[PDB]
Design a protein around this ligand. Structure first.
Ligand SMILES: *[C@@H]1O[C@H](CO)[C@@H](O[C@@H]2O[C@H](CO)[C@@H](O)[C@H](O)[C@H]2NC(C)=O)[C@H](O)[C@H]1NC(C)=O
Ligand SMILES: *[C@@H]1O[C@H](CO)[C@@H](O[C@@H]2O[C@H](CO)[C@@H](O)[C@H](O)[C@H]2NC(C)=O)[C@H](O)[C@H]1NC(C)=O
Ligand SMILES: *[C@@H]1O[C@H](CO)[C@@H](O[C@@H]2O[C@H](CO)[C@@H](O)[C@H](O)[C@H]2NC(C)=O)[C@H](O)[C@H]1NC(C)=O
Ligand SMILES: *[C@@H]1O[C@H](CO)[C@@H](O[C@@H]2O[C@H](CO)[C@@H](O)[C@H](O)[C@H]2NC(C)=O)[C@H](O)[C@H]1NC(C)=O
Ligand SMILES: *[C@@H]1O[C@H](CO)[C@@H](O[C@@H]2O[C@H](CO)[C@@H](O)[C@H](O)[C@H]2NC(C)=O)[C@H](O)[C@H]1NC(C)=O
Ligand SMILES: *[C@@H]1O[C@H](CO)[C@@H](O[C@@H]2O[C@H](CO)[C@@H](O)[C@H](O)[C@H]2NC(C)=O)[C@H](O)[C@H]1NC(C)=O
Ligand SMILES: *[C@@H]1O[C@H](CO)[C@@H](O[C@@H]2O[C@H](CO)[C@@H](O)[C@H](O)[C@H]2NC(C)=O)[C@H](O)[C@H]1NC(C)=O
Ligand SMILES: *[C@@H]1O[C@H](CO)[C@@H](O[C@@H]2O[C@H](CO)[C@@H](O)[C@H](O)[C@H]2NC(C)=O)[C@H](O)[C@H]1NC(C)=O
Lengths: 47, 147, 117, 49, 19
């Protein structure tokens, strides 16, 4: 009932910008969010 | 960019050209004219990553250095992303920054006229926006010539 | 140093969105950062122009963008909509209406107009 | 990210001159950038205080 | 609306300048 499936990669999703030379999009609200980043600093010291 | 923006249908970026920067709509490849030149100028030793055994089955194996490497257990692996996929990412970046500029990222892409995008960049440099409007034709020509 | 002890202005530093502040947390063999950022939301398309044509002179936003709805022009900061009347103190004035491409017709308000007399 | 997705303010980044805008282009095994900068010209001197 | 706002007269010289 299950199998290995081969498929091509997506690149995120398709989008576009209207680019009217007479128009600007301006935010009316915002969200403050917090994300995280993980960075190694040190190795186990050995001898 | 996870939003692959299509090359805008509107080329009215003030007086600016950018056609040699943007992807060529007539080319199977998603490369721009300049990108196509970059690809043509860098020389790769080989392409396609497939050689069949029969293809080197003779004296020829000694002339084809890459095949000679394969016969000694040394191989070359393909990249995960293809040239076309990279061109699609650069296309999205160009579409994004040409039509929304700063605001194409850090959230939803928000459109803005090209001249205004540069006016804000000039204010950022420390040049009054009035310089761009006064010299808008000059600036577009200097850019178009530089490209 | 640049996310916790200062406010980075680098566009791709301290995570995604605009950087506001951060707080470090320790971990075995490393550091984990909590990055607080601002992401603009709920944008709308407003008509825009680089300048307003008043008496033949061109008025440019002192800050923000000059935009409009179906009846009025107003000025707003670019990153968060707050429409305000375009006044002579909200704009730089130079050149003329035949210099700026895309300039539109809108009376600019003079705050001292009543002259208190 | 700093030259294309935003406007870098580092004095020696995104080429020479003041950074105005940039456009990436791909190449085999790398990236090539077109960096558009502003350079002031034709100076004259005036008395100052 | 403003949290922490205090009462302090803000100066404006325009009328004395006019008359
Ligand atoms: C800006 O205006 C457009 C209409 O001109 C809004 O709707 C989209 O317009 C584009 C054309 O540029 C179409 O391809 C999309 O399919 C339209 N959206 C939908 C759901 O049909 C657009 O939403 C407006 N932008 C903002 C921020 O309100
Ligand atoms: C950008 O400039 C090029 C010229 O450098 C324009 O394309 C040329 O169009 C003529 C016909 O009118 C052809 O004979 C040339 O061979 C074309 N040159 C190239 C390099 O394609 C192009 O249309 C301009 N594009 C924009 C958006 O302004
Ligand atoms: C700065 O100098 C340049 C020339 O070095 C001026 O631009 C050129 O002006 C001539 C006429 O004298 C035109 O034929 C050229 O086509 C112009 N160049 C371009 C790219 O359009 C420029 O106008 C001067 N700028 C200022 C502010 O004085
Ligand atoms: C464009 O925005 C202006 C505000 O800047 C709107 O004007 C207000 O309209 C309400 C009615 O809905 C009146 O009660 C206010 O007194 C008006 N304010 C001012 C300063 O005149 C205007 O209606 C909006 N236009 C459109 C087409 O949406
Ligand atoms: C944006 O593009 C439109 C055309 O798509 C320009 O519209 C012209 O505006 C002038 C105003 O004096 C009219 O006389 C023309 O007839 C209009 N053209 C068309 C085809 O209708 C508009 O001016 C451009 N805006 C900017 C800032 O460049
Ligand atoms: C603002 O309105 C004035 C009229 O009150 C416009 O000036 C006239 O425009 C017509 C064409 O529509 C010309 O035939 C007249 O010769 C112009 N008058 C003068 C004294 O030159 C003006 O162009 C409008 N400005 C904007 C930015 O729309
Ligand atoms: C700045 O003023 C000076 C003096 O009028 C101009 O000429 C230079 O003067 C210095 C001495 O102070 C000499 O050592 C230089 O050799 C002179 N320059 C030349 C080309 O002979 C100088 O050109 C003015 N700067 C500008 C931008 O106009
Ligand atoms: C500035 O002083 C005025 C009084 O002169 C304050 O207004 C009153 O504040 C009390 C609460 O302390 C309310 O119960 C009254 O209803 C308010 N009066 C009116 C007419 O609304 C005002 O809040 C003080 N402001 C600040 C920042 O301290």
């Amino acid at each position: 009932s299950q199998s290995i499936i081969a498929y091509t990669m997506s690149l995120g999703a398709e989008n576009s910008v209207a680019y009217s030379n007479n128009s600007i999009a301006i935010p009316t609200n915002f969200t403050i969010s917090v994300t995280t980043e993980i960075l190694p600093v040190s190795m186990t010291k050995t001898s | 960019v996870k939003q692959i923006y299509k090359t805008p249908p509107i080329k009215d970026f003030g007086g600016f050209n950018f056609s040699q920067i943007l992807p060529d709509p007539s080319k199977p490849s998603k490369r721009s004219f300049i990108e196509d030149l970059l690809f043509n100028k860098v020389t790769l030793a080989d392409a396609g990553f497939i050689k069949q055994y029969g293809d080197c089955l003779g004296d020829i194996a000694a002339r084809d250095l890459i095949c000679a490497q394969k016969f000694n257990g040394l191989t070359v692996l393909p990249p995960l992303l293809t040239d076309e996929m990279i061109a699609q990412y650069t296309s999205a970046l160009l579409a994004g920054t040409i039509t929304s500029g700063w605001t194409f990222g850090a959230g939803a892409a928000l459109q803005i006229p090209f001249a205004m995008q540069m006016a804000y960049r000039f204010n950022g440099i420390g040049v009054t926006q009035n310089v761009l409007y006064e010299n808008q034709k000059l600036i577009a020509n200097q850019f178009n010539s530089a490209i | 140093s640049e996310c916790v002890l200062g406010q980075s202005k680098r566009v791709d530093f301290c995570g995604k969105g605009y950087h506001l502040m951060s707080f470090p947390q320790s971990a075995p063999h490393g550091v984990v950062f909590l990055h607080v950022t601002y992401v603009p939301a709920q944008e709308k398309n407003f008509t825009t122009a680089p300048a307003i044509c008043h008496d033949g002179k061109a008025h440019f936003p002192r800050e923000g963008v000059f935009v409009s709805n179906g009846t009025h022009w107003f000025v707003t900061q670019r990153n968060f909509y707050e429409p305000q009347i375009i006044t002579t103190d909200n704009t730089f004035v130079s050149g003329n209406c035949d210099v700026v491409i895309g300039i539109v017709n809108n009376t600019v308000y003079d705050p001292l107009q009543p002259e208190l007399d």
